[PDB]
Design a protein around this nucleic acid. Sequence first.
RNA 1: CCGGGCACUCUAACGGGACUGCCCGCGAAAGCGGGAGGAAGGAGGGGACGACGUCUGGUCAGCAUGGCCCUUACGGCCUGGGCGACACACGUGCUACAAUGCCCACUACAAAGCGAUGCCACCCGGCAACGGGGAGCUAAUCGCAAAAAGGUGGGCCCAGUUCGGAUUGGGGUCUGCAACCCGACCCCAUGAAGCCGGAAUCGCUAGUAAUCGCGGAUCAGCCAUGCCGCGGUGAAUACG
Lengths: 115, 155, 99, 105, 60, 83, 25
Amino acid sequence: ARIAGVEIPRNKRVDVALTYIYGIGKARAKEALEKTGINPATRVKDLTEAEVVRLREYVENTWKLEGELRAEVAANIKRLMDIGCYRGLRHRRGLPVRGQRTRTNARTRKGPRKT
Amino acid sequence: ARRRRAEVRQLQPDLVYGDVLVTAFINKIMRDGKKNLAARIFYDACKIIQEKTGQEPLKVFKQAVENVKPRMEVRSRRVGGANYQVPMEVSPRRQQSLALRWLVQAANQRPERRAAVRIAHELMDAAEGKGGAVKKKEDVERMAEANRAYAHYRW
Amino acid sequence: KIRIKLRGFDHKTLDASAQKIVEAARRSGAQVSGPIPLPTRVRRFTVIRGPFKHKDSREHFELRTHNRLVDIINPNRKTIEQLMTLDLPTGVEIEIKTV
Amino acid sequence: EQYYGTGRRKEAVARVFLRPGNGKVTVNGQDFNEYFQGLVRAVAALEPLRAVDALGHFDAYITVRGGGKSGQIDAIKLGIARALVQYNPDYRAKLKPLGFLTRDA
Amino acid sequence: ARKALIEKAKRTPKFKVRAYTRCVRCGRARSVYRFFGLCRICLRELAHKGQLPGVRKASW
Amino acid sequence: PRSLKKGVFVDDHLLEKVLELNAKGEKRLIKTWSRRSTIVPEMVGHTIAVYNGKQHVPVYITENMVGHKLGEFAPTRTYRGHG
Amino acid sequence: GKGDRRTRRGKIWRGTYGKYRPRKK
RNA sequence: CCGGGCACUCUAACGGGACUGCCCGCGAAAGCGGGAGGAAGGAGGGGACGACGUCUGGUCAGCAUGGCCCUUACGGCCUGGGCGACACACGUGCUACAAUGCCCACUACAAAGCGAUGCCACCCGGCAACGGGGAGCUAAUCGCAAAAAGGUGGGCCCAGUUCGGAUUGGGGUCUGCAACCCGACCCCAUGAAGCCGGAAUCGCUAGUAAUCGCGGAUCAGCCAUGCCGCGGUGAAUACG
Ligand SMILES: [Zn+2]
C-alpha cells in the first residue's frame, strides 16, 4: 500500500507491485517477501494492515532507497566530474561510458537522429 | 526443375490417427523448429472439438479441409509478348497444401488470446464454410469465373 | 609388470610393428596382453590459404598422436634379452617401463 | 531360440534381443512406459509387430546408446524389422510395401 | 620495423605480458600458432614440402 | 581494478620523494613517468609533471578527488575537432 | 541476459558459477 | 569391485561388399522406369584435389628481389603513451524481449583436445574467485572434467512484469615488480533499453533452417560474442 510515502504501489498483486519501486526488484522483493513470509499469490486488496506496516518498517529502514539512492547517484556523477576523469568527461559529453562504439550506435543518450 | 518432375514425397503417418493429411498441418504450424509445440497445439485443437460440439476431430478436419481447397486458380501466361491471366484446374497436390497454408494464416489473424481457441474455432469455421480461408478460396473461385472468357489460351 | 608403450602417428606401420611384437612374444611361448589401442590425440591447426587479408577460406590441419599399449605379465629371461636388441624403430617412439 | 537385431538411425544404436514370451518389454533395465513418459511416438516402434499382428507374442530386452529420443525409437523399429526378417523371413513381401527396413539417411 | 620487431620480440623480460609470440622464419606479428611458433604462411610452405613431421592434409 | 585484499597506490619512488618533501617544504615541481597509480589521498597542492608521450604536462592536485588515478587527468589524445 | 549477471542466460554465456546459477540439478 | 573369460563394446589396422550388374518396360543406341539384394545403391554423404589461361586485382609491411635512399640514421636503446580515440555512415558477431517463457531440485548425455619447466585428485577456511597443503600422472591409465541442451517436482503468469536489465557505489581473488586512460575475475545495490524492429538486403532444398554444451591454438592477462574443431539434438521445404 502506501509504503514509501509519496511513491504508492497498490492495485492487484503486491509482490509484483513492490518491484515497481525504484530500489526494489524481483530479487530483493522475494528477499523481503520471504522474510515477512507473506505468500505472493494473493493480491494487495486482500491483506492485513499490520503486514503492510511491517513491510514499511522493513524495507524503509534496511537498505538505501528512493531519496538517498537518487541523491547518491547525483553525488556519484558530481564526483565523476570536477576531477578530470574519463568517466566524468564522458558523462559531460552526454555519451555512454561502457566502451561502446559511437561510429554507429549510441543514440539512446545521444538523442534523436541529427542528420 | 527442368526435366525431372520434382519427385513426390510422402510423410510419415500420424501417431494418433494414422493418416497423413494432418501431418503437413502439424508441420506448417511448426514454427522455427518446434514439433513438440506443433503437435501439442494441434492435439489441443482436437480436444477443443469435443466440447465445442460432439464431433470427431478427424471427420471435422476432413470437412475443414475439403471446402477450402479450390477447384480453379489463375496464372499469368505470356502469349506473344503479352501477359494474359488464364484460370485452370489446380492440382490436388497443391490443393491441400495451399489449403492448410490458408488455414494457418486465417487462424493467426483471429483476435483471440490463445492460439488453441484461434485454430479450433477457425477449423469449424472452415468446415461450416464461413472461415477466412474458405473466404480466400471464394475470392479465387470468383476471380477464375470472372476470367472464364480465357477458354482458348489454355495449356 | 612391464608396460610397453608405442607412440607414433601412422597406424599402418604402427599397428603392423605392434602386431609383430605380439607375434614375437607369442613366439616366446607364454601369454601376453592383447594390443589395447589407446585413442589418438588430435592437435589441429587452422591456417589461411592466402598470405594476407582473407578472414574466410581457412584450411585445417591435424596432428594424430597414436598410442598403442601392450603389457607383459610373463617376463621370460631371453624374452627380455630379445626385446632390447631386436628393437627396430620405424619412426615410432618406444617406452619400456617396469612397476 | 533367441533373435538379435540391430537398428541405426541419427546416431542412436539400438541393440534389441527379442525372446518368445508374453509381450513384456524393457529398455536398458528400466521399462517402456516410464522411460517414454508423456511422449507421443512410443507406438511407432511397436508398429512392425502390429503389422504382423504379433501383439503379445514377443518379449524384448533393449539396450540403446547415443542420440535423443526419436532416433532411438526409429532405431528400435529398424531393429525389430532386422530381427523379424531373421525369424520367419517370409515377412519381406509384406514388409517392403509398408517400408520398415529403410534406414533414413 | 620487420627485423627490429623480431629481434625485440625475443626479449621476454620487462613485464612478459608486454611480450608477444612471433614467427621465426617469416616474421608475422599476428596469427602465429603456439603449437608450432610459425606464421600461417610458414606452415603452408613447410608442411607441403613434407618438412614438417606429424602433419597431414586432413581429408574427411 | 585492484582489490581490497591488497592496498591502493603501492609505489616506492615518488612516495619517498614526497615524504622527503613534506618534512622540509618549498613544494617545487616533480617529474613522473609512472602514471600507473593513484595520487589523491595524502597529496594536495603539489606540482607534478606527467608525460603524455610527447610533452611533460604540469598537474596541480586538489581536494575534490577521492580515488582517481593519475593518468586519467592528462590524456594522450589530440582531437581538436574533425570539421 | 547475455550482458547481465543477475540472470541465468548471461551466467551460461559468461560460463561462471554464482548465487543465481549454482551447481544443483 | 575382484578373480576370470575376454565372445563381444571398444581402439586402431586392414580387407570384403554395391556397382545403372539382374530382368521387365522404354528407346537404333545412349539414356530413362520396376523390383530383387543389402549397412550402404542405382555417384551413399562428403573430405582433399582445384586443366591451359584470367584480372598483372594483393603484398619488397609475411621474406627474398633491380634500384634509389638515411648511418651520429628510416638502426638500436629505455621511458611514457598511442594504436582501444569520437559528431559520426556501413556491414559483419551475439543474446533477448516470455508463457511450448522464467527461475528452482536431483538425476542422467557425449565427443573432441591439453598437460609430471605443467594437468592438476582432494580437502581445509572462506558465499566466493583463491590460499594452506598436496596425491596421481612425461600421461585412453592421474588430471583438466561439470557435458550441456534435457526430464521430472515445485514456485509463478502476458503483468516491463521471478521476462528483461544498463549503469552507479564500494569491497574480496588472482596474472604482470608495476594493470589509469586500456587486462580478466568474485560480490553486492540499482537496474537503462528492448514487450518486438523503415527503404532495403542477402543466405540457404536433409541433418541443413534452427539448436546446445565441451575442449583445444595466438594467452603472463584477458579484450574472443574472434576463430577451428568437437560432439547433443534435427522440421518442413524443392508444384514452378
Ligand atoms: Zn611464417
